[PDB]
Amino acid sequence: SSVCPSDNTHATGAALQKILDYKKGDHQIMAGYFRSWRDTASGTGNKVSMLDLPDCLDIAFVFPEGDETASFWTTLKDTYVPALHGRGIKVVRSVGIAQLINTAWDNTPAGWQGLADALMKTVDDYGLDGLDIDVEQSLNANQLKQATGVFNALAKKLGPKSGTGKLLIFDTNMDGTQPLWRNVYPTISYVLIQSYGRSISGLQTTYNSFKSYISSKQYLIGFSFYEENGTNWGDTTTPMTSSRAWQYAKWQPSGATKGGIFSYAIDRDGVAIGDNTLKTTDFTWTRQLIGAMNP
Numbered sequence: 001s002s003v004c005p006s007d008n009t010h011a012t013g014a015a016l017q018k019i020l021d022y023k024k025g026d027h028q029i030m031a032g033y034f035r036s037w038r039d040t041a042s043g044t045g046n047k048v049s050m051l052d053l054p055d056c057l058d059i060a061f062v063f064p065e066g067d068e069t070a071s072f073w074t075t076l077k078d079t080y081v082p083a084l085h086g087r088g089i090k091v092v093r094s095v096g097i098a099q100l101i102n103t104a105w106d107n108t109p110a111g112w113q114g115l116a117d118a119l120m121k122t123v124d125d126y127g128l129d130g131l132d133i134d135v136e137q138s139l140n141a142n143q144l145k146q147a148t149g150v151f152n153a154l155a156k157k158l159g160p161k162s163g164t165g166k167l168l169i170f171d172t173n174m175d176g177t178q179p180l181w182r183n184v185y186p187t188i189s190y191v192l193i194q195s196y197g198r199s200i201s202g203l204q205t206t207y208n209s210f211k212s213y214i215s216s217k218q219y220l221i222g223f224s225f226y227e228e229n230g231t232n233w234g235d236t237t238t239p240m241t242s243s244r245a246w247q248y249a250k251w252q253p254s255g256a257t258k259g260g261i262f263s264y265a266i267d268r269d270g271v272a273i274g275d276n277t278l279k280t281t282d283f284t285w286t287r288q289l290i291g292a293m294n295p
């Protein structure tokens, strides 16, 4: 990734083209969850724009909580998606598993299709590159049937079964024994393991629970930046090169190469642990971690 800037410059010419070429070639990828309610185009008081995101990012997740102002969604559609696409950055909408097990939607083939159609509007209306499902709970038999049905309906438009080039992503804090994963693994582009605060020594065990269902390049492990007023996971302690985030950038499963890493709350890149104020960011941690993976 020598072609990436040592600061947060947005390249423009042959300098941009080299970044677009880097992204088309083999490399460990970097993804980031951008908390939508923290975007400067949402409400008041925020300091970071999705426009700020570093050129060498591979995937930005639009990660809302549902109280965002209309202006955020307008800006995403009209300004952010075009600008990130100009940088070869993919933009994926995140939705919680709760949305796919919502009992307002019939637990039938027609209901799975109807709910998939509604979810595909969050992709198609914004010009996005796919959908990310956040799975952080176990499912009862009925929930598992409904979620599996929706994934199978989505797989007509997204992910490896679709042929569209659009992504279907499974992000989870659970392992590859979860029934939902056993049901939907053939539909998935990337699997992202929420690994905030975890032991470097337990990473192989988790990877081993998925590895029969994927190739290693589909697998990403995630750390968290420090969220204002949030959990102190301690993934981004100083010095950087000793951090959990840095150890994740360097970690490889035995005999294979992982797909890469992601951050939770990429809008918080470089804010000190315990600092509960909002700050601008030049994405030093994101840019350095891309370098750590692609030397």
Ligand SMILES: C[C@@H]1O[C@@H](O)[C@@H](O)[C@H](O)[C@@H]1O
Residues within 6 Å of the ligand: 173, 194, 195, 196, 197, 198
């Ligand atoms: C229950 C928690 O869920 C996610 O936040 C993971 O990132 C943590 O490591 C932990 O498993």
